[PDB]
Amino acid sequence: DPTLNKTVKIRQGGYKGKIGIVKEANGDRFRVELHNPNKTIPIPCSFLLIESTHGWVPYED
Amino acid sequence: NLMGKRVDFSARTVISGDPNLELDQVGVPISIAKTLSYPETVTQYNIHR
Amino acid sequence: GVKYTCGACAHNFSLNKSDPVRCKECGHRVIYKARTKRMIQFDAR
Amino acid sequence: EPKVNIINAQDDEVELMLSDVNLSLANSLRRTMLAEVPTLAIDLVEIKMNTSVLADEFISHRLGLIPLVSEDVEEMKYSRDCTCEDYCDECSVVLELSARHEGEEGTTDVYSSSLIKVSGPGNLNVGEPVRRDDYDQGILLCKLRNHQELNIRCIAKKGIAKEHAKWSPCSAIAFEYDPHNKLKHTDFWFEVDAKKEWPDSKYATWEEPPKPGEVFDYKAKPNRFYMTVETTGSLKANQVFSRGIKTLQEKLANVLFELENSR
Amino acid sequence: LMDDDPVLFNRQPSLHKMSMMAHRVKVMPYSTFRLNLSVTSPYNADFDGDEMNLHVPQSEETRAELSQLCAVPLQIVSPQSNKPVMGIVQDTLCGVR
Amino acid sequence: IHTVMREKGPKICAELFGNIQKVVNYWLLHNGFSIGIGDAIADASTMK
Amino acid sequence: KVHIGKVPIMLRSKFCSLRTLDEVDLYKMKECPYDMGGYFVINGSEKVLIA
Amino acid sequence: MIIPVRCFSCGKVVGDKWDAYLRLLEEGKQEGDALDELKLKRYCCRRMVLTHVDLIEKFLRYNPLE
Amino acid sequence: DDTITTEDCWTVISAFFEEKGLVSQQLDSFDEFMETSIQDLVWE
Amino acid sequence: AGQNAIVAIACYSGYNQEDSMIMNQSSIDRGLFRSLFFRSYMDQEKRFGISIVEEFEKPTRATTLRLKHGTYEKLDEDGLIAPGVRVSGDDIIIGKTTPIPPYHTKRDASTPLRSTENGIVDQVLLTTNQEGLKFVKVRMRTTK
RNA sequence: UAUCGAGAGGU
Ligand SMILES: Nc1ncnc2c1ncn2[C@@H]1O[C@H](COP(=O)(O)CP(=O)(O)OP(=O)(O)O)[C@@H](O)[C@H]1O
Ligand SMILES: [Mg+2]
Ligand SMILES: [Zn+2]
Ligand SMILES: [Zn+2]
Ligand SMILES: [Zn+2]
């Protein structure tokens, strides 16, 4: 998958506005390693923005 | 190594009291409950579960 | 390549891994990595 | 039937007597003011530079505790309910801080007054770091020495103290009733004489002591509740008491809605 | 591991058989094992740093031995002195007086 | 406890602990109980 | 003057390079003024002798 | 390390009173009276200022590492 | 004169630690080893 | 080495029997008994022959066998992670290889963060040892 | 994902 280990911002949910890294993206349900507290959370891939060449891009990267 | 030995499916942590648990219960942290496992045989009655 | 900082004189510089490990300014051989390019967030709780 | 008597008042504390209500209502109001009255507070800190002797999250924790003006926070949305991506101008206030020490000598003390509001849901009065006077530097945040720098960008969000105590508008809430123990709700510990050994309520002169003959009124209930609401300045004391009543109402209203929908 | 799974629970030193009793799991947040206060006595457990051990049976046969022989309620009376080894203690005993 | 065990069996007897605990701990939560330095102090006559 | 070996120096003793200096230069040597010595540094590890 | 922003027990802000407290002590006031003047009425709040130790002054002596 | 008080006793004790500190039995012992014992041991 | 806590000796909800204790969550929120925790990891390059030495680097999968299972994507080109980066257990924080005796010629000798720990990289020391080979320390910080 | 030891600790 092309978005593992890439930095992410969360746009929905209780973790909205928080930075993270895609630790595991098996399918549809991703595991983002939050930066702020030491915990890796389950989150749907729809909830993520990925960083790319120009700003934070949804899962069209 | 023979009269006693180290074993799989074991766990250990600090203990606390709970006034709201039954006498025969043990409260188990989620992280421990996700590391330990039980091998349940698949039958018609539990395959969906 | 990678930014460092001299533990004695605080000069900032880069090294291309093959360079010897010392400060160009004072020759000190104890140096420290500079902070990450990445943004850091904290929850203020 | 509810009655109110404001004993004293000022910006950050109101002393008042509350009467002709149930104990449970005075207590639920006490709890609501402590735990569920929204305020605004820093909840996300973007550290672009921190070469001070303090750790990033050490500083972030102090930032969250800085009281911010929350007067218009009721018209502001929660981040979790806002349709935007990341934070935005309708659900957050952005503050920025930048400090530096130039000079080879001395120490620069960084205060909460150097927090500069950059954006926010205009023209709502929310997001300014609370100040006592006009010459008030506010809360000490950090200290800097030659070449040490602090450059942070803060996102402030609406929240309640159930989530984190930094969103509470109160400090203590003094609260008492029956200063002469006529109701017999407490049984006093003593060595020789209970009356001489226990101090007087500060509201002892607001009710009359029991007469030496008086029989025990086993039907009396608590009915006069003296309380003082102190705040941190994010909200004025009268605002906390008013919004406490409002918040407890919406909570009961939502329950009533759900019952009338279960039909 | 899931609610009501039988597990063997144990505090050292394992001086007698009710140092190892079978409990019903209740999965809970936070990182401690939780005990009803009335089982502290047979374990000689308290909460000043004590730790305890949990073992998970791996078959229908060993689950049944735990639930039908070792379970806490089966252990309330011990053959040591033909009397109970568990009672009301601490807050509940102070309070019941 | 000994009697309920013999008379009602281990299941009922195990519930007995929980029942007693839940009533008493509630009552004690709302009654309170403490101890302080004062409880070590005998009066001046007894000290003499 | 033939060299017969090296002897580990107890910090803050009379033969330690820290005995002079004084708080100003202690701070420059990254040394804490609350550290009273009485121990050695052997391969980076602080070792104390037990009476 | 540095004066806490809030009283741990009640939440009252005390992080804006550290300089004023040191100043009252220079002016010769006794600690109890200085706390009284600062309107620190509850003893939880008084403990915060009375027993704080300003260690950041010690940490600053260590010549910055950049 | 007058009587030596408890506060005076603590004045004496402060003087002890002012001169000796807390680890002087470590430092003085090692100092004697460098000053004298190595030399004497060689001449044994 | 401690804090002045406001303490009630009381039976409250029964969650402090047998030497446990009830702590005020709001006091914790405001900083009570909070602490920093630091762990330093040390590694250095070893010599096995005249020109056979270990090397700090981010090891490429094509040339190095027995890579660790954790991520190597937080390592810089010098084989070291940079301060400010969040790390979780088994993440690689020091990349190091050892050559294989006589393509695909090196063997992994990297250091993962301890599996039971997490936090933020606080400081990274790079230097040489008494023998002239490279020598590193990685300090991790978290708040408990 | 080493082995052999040592030391300091927890109930
Ligand atoms: N060295 C040791 N060897 C074996 N078991 C030990 C031990 N130290 C402690 N224990 C275990 O821990 C128990 C000690 O409990 P403690 O907490 O040390 C004292 P107590 O008698 O329960 O309470 P007290 O502190 O009120 O006197 C022993 O009875 C035993 O169960
Ligand atoms: Mg114990
Ligand atoms: Zn230099
Ligand atoms: Zn928004
Ligand atoms: Zn207080």
mmCIF file of all heavy atoms in Angstrom, chain A residues 30-50:
data_model
loop_
_atom_site.group_PDB
_atom_site.id
_atom_site.type_symbol
_atom_site.label_atom_id
_atom_site.label_comp_id
_atom_site.label_asym_id
_atom_site.label_seq_id
_atom_site.Cartn_x
_atom_site.Cartn_y
_atom_site.Cartn_z
ATOM 1 N N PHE A 30 -7.500 1.492 8.994
ATOM 2 C CA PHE A 30 -6.079 1.763 9.164
ATOM 3 C C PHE A 30 -5.718 1.836 10.644
ATOM 4 O O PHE A 30 -6.577 1.996 11.515
ATOM 5 C CB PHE A 30 -5.669 3.080 8.491
ATOM 6 C CG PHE A 30 -5.614 3.023 6.991
ATOM 7 C CD1 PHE A 30 -6.247 2.017 6.284
ATOM 8 C CD2 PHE A 30 -4.934 4.003 6.284
ATOM 9 C CE1 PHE A 30 -6.196 1.983 4.904
ATOM 10 C CE2 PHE A 30 -4.876 3.974 4.906
ATOM 11 C CZ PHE A 30 -5.508 2.965 4.216
ATOM 12 N N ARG A 31 -4.420 1.727 10.916
ATOM 13 C CA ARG A 31 -3.868 1.942 12.248
ATOM 14 C C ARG A 31 -2.949 3.156 12.162
ATOM 15 O O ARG A 31 -1.867 3.081 11.569
ATOM 16 C CB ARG A 31 -3.120 0.703 12.756
ATOM 17 C CG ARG A 31 -4.015 -0.506 13.043
ATOM 18 C CD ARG A 31 -3.338 -1.586 13.899
ATOM 19 N NE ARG A 31 -3.403 -1.285 15.328
ATOM 20 C CZ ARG A 31 -2.361 -1.314 16.156
ATOM 21 N NH1 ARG A 31 -1.157 -1.647 15.709
ATOM 22 N NH2 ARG A 31 -2.521 -1.018 17.441
ATOM 23 N N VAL A 32 -3.391 4.276 12.728
ATOM 24 C CA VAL A 32 -2.602 5.504 12.782
ATOM 25 C C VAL A 32 -1.927 5.592 14.146
ATOM 26 O O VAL A 32 -2.581 5.431 15.185
ATOM 27 C CB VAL A 32 -3.474 6.747 12.512
ATOM 28 C CG1 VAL A 32 -2.746 8.013 12.934
ATOM 29 C CG2 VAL A 32 -3.843 6.819 11.041
ATOM 30 N N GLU A 33 -0.617 5.829 14.142
ATOM 31 C CA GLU A 33 0.151 6.032 15.369
ATOM 32 C C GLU A 33 0.081 7.516 15.694
ATOM 33 O O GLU A 33 0.790 8.328 15.097
ATOM 34 C CB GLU A 33 1.588 5.551 15.193
ATOM 35 C CG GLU A 33 2.578 6.036 16.249
ATOM 36 C CD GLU A 33 4.031 5.834 15.828
ATOM 37 O OE1 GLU A 33 4.573 4.722 16.024
ATOM 38 O OE2 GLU A 33 4.628 6.787 15.281
ATOM 39 N N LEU A 34 -0.805 7.874 16.619
ATOM 40 C CA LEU A 34 -0.934 9.262 17.024
ATOM 41 C C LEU A 34 0.398 9.778 17.540
ATOM 42 O O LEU A 34 1.216 9.031 18.074
ATOM 43 C CB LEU A 34 -2.002 9.418 18.107
ATOM 44 C CG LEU A 34 -3.439 9.109 17.707
ATOM 45 C CD1 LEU A 34 -4.359 9.493 18.838
ATOM 46 C CD2 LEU A 34 -3.812 9.851 16.439
ATOM 47 N N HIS A 35 0.629 11.067 17.361
ATOM 48 C CA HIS A 35 1.856 11.659 17.879
ATOM 49 C C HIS A 35 1.719 12.069 19.332
ATOM 50 O O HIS A 35 2.680 11.932 20.099
ATOM 51 C CB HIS A 35 2.248 12.869 17.035
ATOM 52 C CG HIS A 35 3.555 13.487 17.416
ATOM 53 N ND1 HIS A 35 3.705 14.293 18.523
ATOM 54 C CD2 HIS A 35 4.771 13.423 16.826
ATOM 55 C CE1 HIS A 35 4.960 14.691 18.603
ATOM 56 N NE2 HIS A 35 5.627 14.182 17.582
ATOM 57 N N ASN A 36 0.530 12.559 19.718
ATOM 58 C CA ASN A 36 0.337 13.388 20.903
ATOM 59 C C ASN A 36 0.342 12.533 22.172
ATOM 60 O O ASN A 36 1.150 12.809 23.075
ATOM 61 C CB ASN A 36 -0.942 14.240 20.776
ATOM 62 C CG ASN A 36 -1.534 14.237 19.352
ATOM 63 O OD1 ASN A 36 -2.540 13.571 19.092
ATOM 64 N ND2 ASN A 36 -0.920 15.002 18.437
ATOM 65 N N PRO A 37 -0.526 11.482 22.307
ATOM 66 C CA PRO A 37 -0.277 10.487 23.363
ATOM 67 C C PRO A 37 0.266 9.185 22.787
ATOM 68 O O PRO A 37 0.075 8.909 21.598
ATOM 69 C CB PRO A 37 -1.660 10.299 24.006
ATOM 70 C CG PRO A 37 -2.651 10.987 23.064
ATOM 71 C CD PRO A 37 -1.896 11.333 21.804
ATOM 72 N N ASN A 38 0.955 8.379 23.598
ATOM 73 C CA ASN A 38 1.622 7.171 23.100
ATOM 74 C C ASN A 38 0.587 6.061 22.931
ATOM 75 O O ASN A 38 0.464 5.143 23.747
ATOM 76 C CB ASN A 38 2.749 6.742 24.033
ATOM 77 C CG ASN A 38 3.680 7.881 24.405
ATOM 78 O OD1 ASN A 38 4.103 8.671 23.557
ATOM 79 N ND2 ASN A 38 4.002 7.969 25.684
ATOM 80 N N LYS A 39 -0.166 6.144 21.836
ATOM 81 C CA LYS A 39 -1.161 5.130 21.518
ATOM 82 C C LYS A 39 -1.359 5.095 20.010
ATOM 83 O O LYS A 39 -1.302 6.135 19.346
ATOM 84 C CB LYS A 39 -2.494 5.401 22.232
ATOM 85 C CG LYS A 39 -3.249 6.611 21.704
ATOM 86 C CD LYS A 39 -4.448 6.958 22.570
ATOM 87 C CE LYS A 39 -5.469 5.836 22.607
ATOM 88 N NZ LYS A 39 -6.722 6.246 23.315
ATOM 89 N N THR A 40 -1.569 3.895 19.474
ATOM 90 C CA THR A 40 -1.898 3.699 18.066
ATOM 91 C C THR A 40 -3.366 3.310 17.983
ATOM 92 O O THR A 40 -3.781 2.327 18.605
ATOM 93 C CB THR A 40 -1.013 2.628 17.432
ATOM 94 O OG1 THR A 40 0.357 3.044 17.493
ATOM 95 C CG2 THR A 40 -1.404 2.408 15.981
ATOM 96 N N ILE A 41 -4.148 4.074 17.225
ATOM 97 C CA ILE A 41 -5.604 3.941 17.256
ATOM 98 C C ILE A 41 -6.138 3.290 15.983
ATOM 99 O O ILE A 41 -5.494 3.375 14.928
ATOM 100 C CB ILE A 41 -6.274 5.305 17.466
ATOM 101 C CG1 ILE A 41 -6.118 6.156 16.204
ATOM 102 C CG2 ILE A 41 -5.678 6.010 18.679
ATOM 103 C CD1 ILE A 41 -6.984 7.389 16.174
ATOM 104 N N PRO A 42 -7.295 2.629 16.034
ATOM 105 C CA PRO A 42 -7.975 2.230 14.790
ATOM 106 C C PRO A 42 -8.834 3.339 14.217
ATOM 107 O O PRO A 42 -9.640 3.940 14.939
ATOM 108 C CB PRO A 42 -8.819 1.015 15.221
ATOM 109 C CG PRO A 42 -8.357 0.670 16.619
ATOM 110 C CD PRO A 42 -7.877 1.958 17.204
ATOM 111 N N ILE A 43 -8.689 3.619 12.934
ATOM 112 C CA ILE A 43 -9.411 4.705 12.291
ATOM 113 C C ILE A 43 -9.733 4.310 10.852
ATOM 114 O O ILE A 43 -8.925 3.624 10.205
ATOM 115 C CB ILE A 43 -8.606 6.016 12.375
ATOM 116 C CG1 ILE A 43 -9.477 7.220 12.048
ATOM 117 C CG2 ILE A 43 -7.384 5.966 11.472
ATOM 118 C CD1 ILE A 43 -8.892 8.519 12.524
ATOM 119 N N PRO A 44 -10.906 4.665 10.322
ATOM 120 C CA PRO A 44 -11.180 4.402 8.906
ATOM 121 C C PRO A 44 -10.349 5.303 8.005
ATOM 122 O O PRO A 44 -10.046 6.450 8.342
ATOM 123 C CB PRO A 44 -12.677 4.705 8.771
ATOM 124 C CG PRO A 44 -12.980 5.619 9.912
ATOM 125 C CD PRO A 44 -12.095 5.166 11.029
ATOM 126 N N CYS A 45 -9.978 4.763 6.840
ATOM 127 C CA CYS A 45 -9.134 5.503 5.909
ATOM 128 C C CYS A 45 -9.832 6.748 5.375
ATOM 129 O O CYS A 45 -9.156 7.716 5.000
ATOM 130 C CB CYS A 45 -8.679 4.568 4.778
ATOM 131 S SG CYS A 45 -9.099 5.045 3.076
ATOM 132 N N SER A 46 -11.168 6.758 5.375
ATOM 133 C CA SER A 46 -11.931 7.948 5.008
ATOM 134 C C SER A 46 -11.656 9.141 5.925
ATOM 135 O O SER A 46 -11.855 10.287 5.509
ATOM 136 C CB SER A 46 -13.426 7.603 5.013
ATOM 137 O OG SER A 46 -14.240 8.760 5.137
ATOM 138 N N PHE A 47 -11.202 8.906 7.157
ATOM 139 C CA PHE A 47 -11.036 9.962 8.150
ATOM 140 C C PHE A 47 -9.698 10.686 8.051
ATOM 141 O O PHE A 47 -9.464 11.630 8.815
ATOM 142 C CB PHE A 47 -11.173 9.393 9.573
ATOM 143 C CG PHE A 47 -12.594 9.153 10.016
ATOM 144 C CD1 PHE A 47 -13.615 8.979 9.098
ATOM 145 C CD2 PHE A 47 -12.900 9.087 11.363
ATOM 146 C CE1 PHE A 47 -14.914 8.753 9.523
ATOM 147 C CE2 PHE A 47 -14.194 8.864 11.790
ATOM 148 C CZ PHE A 47 -15.201 8.697 10.872
ATOM 149 N N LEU A 48 -8.818 10.274 7.142
ATOM 150 C CA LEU A 48 -7.439 10.739 7.126
ATOM 151 C C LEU A 48 -7.185 11.716 5.984
ATOM 152 O O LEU A 48 -7.749 11.579 4.893
ATOM 153 C CB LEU A 48 -6.462 9.563 6.997
ATOM 154 C CG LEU A 48 -6.516 8.430 8.015
ATOM 155 C CD1 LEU A 48 -5.358 7.461 7.781
ATOM 156 C CD2 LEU A 48 -6.502 8.972 9.434
ATOM 157 N N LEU A 49 -6.332 12.701 6.251
ATOM 158 C CA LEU A 49 -5.661 13.499 5.233
ATOM 159 C C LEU A 49 -4.189 13.110 5.228
ATOM 160 O O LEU A 49 -3.581 12.961 6.293
ATOM 161 C CB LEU A 49 -5.814 14.999 5.502
ATOM 162 C CG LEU A 49 -7.190 15.649 5.315
ATOM 163 C CD1 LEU A 49 -7.168 17.100 5.773
ATOM 164 C CD2 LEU A 49 -7.635 15.566 3.867
ATOM 165 N N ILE A 50 -3.624 12.928 4.037
ATOM 166 C CA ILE A 50 -2.220 12.570 3.864
ATOM 167 C C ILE A 50 -1.467 13.796 3.366
ATOM 168 O O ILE A 50 -2.013 14.593 2.597
ATOM 169 C CB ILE A 50 -2.070 11.399 2.875
ATOM 170 C CG1 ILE A 50 -3.164 10.368 3.141
ATOM 171 C CG2 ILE A 50 -0.677 10.782 2.973
ATOM 172 C CD1 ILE A 50 -3.142 9.215 2.195
#
